[PDB]
Amino acid sequence: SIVMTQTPKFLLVSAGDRVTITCKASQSVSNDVTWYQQKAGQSPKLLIYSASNRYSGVPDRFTGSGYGTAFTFTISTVQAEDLAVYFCQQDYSSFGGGTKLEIKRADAAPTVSIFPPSSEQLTSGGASVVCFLNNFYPKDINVKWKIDGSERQNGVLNSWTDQDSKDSTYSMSSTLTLTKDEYERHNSYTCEATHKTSTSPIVKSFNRNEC
Amino acid sequence: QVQLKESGPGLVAPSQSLSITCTVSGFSVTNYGVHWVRQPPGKGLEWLGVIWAGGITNYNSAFMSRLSISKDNSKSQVFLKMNSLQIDDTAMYYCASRGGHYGYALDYWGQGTSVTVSSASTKGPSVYPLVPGCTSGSSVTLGCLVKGYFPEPVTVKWNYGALSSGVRTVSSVLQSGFYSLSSLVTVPSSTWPSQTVICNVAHPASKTELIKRIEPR
């Protein structure tokens, strides 16, 4: 029970920009504040201890300051790979609510691939068709499926990657899952991707009888 | 070098207990305290308690009569037991420790063990090849579609981790009580199929380790 109020909750910054996160303690705590970095799917990593000391291995662009109640953590010059959640801690049970650092970069159009169901899945009674949209920015994107030239919305599941550590782009898959019987009732399968990079869609298609 | 490593069940039924072990190398649990910290999905950390070198335990009171931390110095193991789980106990569970005079900072963390609380049943994934249908192009994108598993997580590697550049693994999606994801990799269209490409899919809950070779139509 000390509260660490951490702001902002989200940052969107370009590579090379400066970031500053603040944690305000509910009581005066000298320099007894820690900063951690947690990248997607990883454990926390110590960056800064006793308010202002860089750990071992921590790069110079990471700094902390403060004493008493108002604590600051700064990244001088944000690199692509700094995409992470950052948070403060006071005593062992007092954490700040975290700051998600997201990267903005130049808009990028997706590369589209289409994949028919595999023979293995067909044997199981299932048929998933996948449309993969790779390396685009920003994250928002649309996919429209047509079967025998008719729009099909049912059976579609969409899912994105986390932002890329190196290039700061997103990728996503759109998966249309049918039964084998339904799949075998139709021949042409098309997906159409539309992204803000163009009013024109990007299409990929196949025919089951060729596949 | 120091390593902390959690081991745990993956799935716990509502109202039942969770037992996890943290195994330590690189320092003596006789001399250093070891903490438990958890992280519910998409949320922040939550400290549970600590067992100090001498054996004193301190706990987070939000867990008042529910938690037991203990250790066996002779096995370099620290244990957590948490009674009466409910769905909001679903979390990643970490053990953590401090190797130096870093104030309250913990510099050592385990990889974590994922715990899901649910009345449902562990179910191994099926893995299906994503192979270009029937190409021109300087690159080729290949993939593995992983469906029907429960609980989370699964991991996907390509050529046992050796193929890392150009790997894209989407988030899992929950539908009808089961998870699916896909993982894709882009390689030069010269490199496949002339060199073998396989995906490696692990699902710790069912102790599953699959290999699927991607081959040309």
Residue numbers in the entry:
A (entry chain L): 1 to 92, 96 to 214
B (entry chain H): 1 to 82, 82A, 82B, 82C, 83 to 100, 100A, 100B, 100C, ...
Question: How does the study describe this entry?
Answer:
The disialoganglioside GD2, in particular, is a glycolipid antigen that is highly expressed on tumors of both pediatric and adult cancers, including neuroblastoma, retinoblastoma, melanoma, brain tumors, sarcomas and small cell lung cancer. MoAb 3F8 is a murine IgG3 with a moderate affinity for GD2 (KD = 5 nM). 3F8 binds to FcγRII and FcγRIII for neutrophil- and NK-mediated ADCC (antibody-dependent cell-mediated cytotoxicity), respectively, and the CR3 receptor is also important for cytotoxicity.
In this study, we report the high-resolution crystal structure of the murine anti-GD2 MoAb 3F8, which has the highest relative affinity among a series of anti-GD2 MoAbs. The 3F8 Fab structure had an immunoglobulin fold common to all Fab structures. The heavy chain residues 129–130 were found to be disordered. Disorder in this region has been observed for other Fab structures. Based on this analysis, CDOCKER was utilized to create a docked model of GD2 to the crystal structure of 3F8. Based on the crystal structure of the 3F8 Fab fragment and the comparative analysis, the relatively high affinity of 3F8 to GD2 compared to other antibodies is due to the extensive network of interactions involving main-chain and side-chain hydrogen bonding, two Pi – CH interactions, and an important charged interaction between Arg95 of the H3 loop with the penultimate sialic acid residue of GD2.
